Ligand binder design. Structure first.
Ligand SMILES: N#CCc1ccccc1CC(=O)N1CCC[C@H](C(N)=O)C1
Ligand SMILES: [Zn+2]
Length: 139
């Protein structure tokens, strides 16, 4: 679990969005596993606008942060789950690092701010849904 809070927006994994997120829907994209909802309170986070490929992510299944080298956002095949059929997920970045079911929503950050959130994983890999291209989050 986990979310990004920036301005009057809450960014969460689409498959973990609540009834309240859907009732205050701003934008969603099943192909990216992202959903953005509106909030009444101003948010705590800053979004990176960069092309960093190194950063640090929070891993809830270890209660620890880990450094990672990650691939550029791309179209990656993701196996079927209870949430989605087998499909290509877009804007996804992979890295070697621990992740297990329950770790989605952990933040990945570089020196410029928030880069994205955990969205996939398995076998010593962790995948992050990029948010750096969503320029409208800042206005
Ligand atoms: N961290 C983590 C998740 C994880 C880690 C390790 C093993 C398995 C998983 C679960 C998994 O990859 N997904 C289930 C939920 C929806 C995700 C998607 N974006 O399509 C895919
Ligand atoms: Zn950066």
């Amino acid at each position: 679990s986990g979310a990004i809070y920036v301005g009057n927006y809450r960014v969460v994994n689409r498959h973990l969005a609540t009834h309240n997120d859907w009732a205050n829907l701003v934008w969603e994209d099943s192909s990216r596993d992202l959903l953005v909802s509106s909030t009444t309170a101003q948010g705590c986070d800053t979004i990176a606008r960069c092309d960093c490929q190194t950063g640090v992510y929070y891993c809830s299944s270890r209660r620890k942060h880990y450094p990672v080298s990650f691939s550029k956002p791309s179209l990656i095949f993701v196996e079927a789950s209870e949430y989605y059929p087998a499909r290509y997920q877009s804007h996804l970045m992979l890295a070697v690092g621990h992740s297990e079911p329950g770790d989605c929503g952990g933040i990945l950050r570089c020196q410029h701010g928030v880069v994205g959130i955990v969205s996939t994983g398995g076998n010593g890999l962790v995948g992050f849904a990029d948010v750096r291209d969503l320029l409208w989050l800042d206005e």
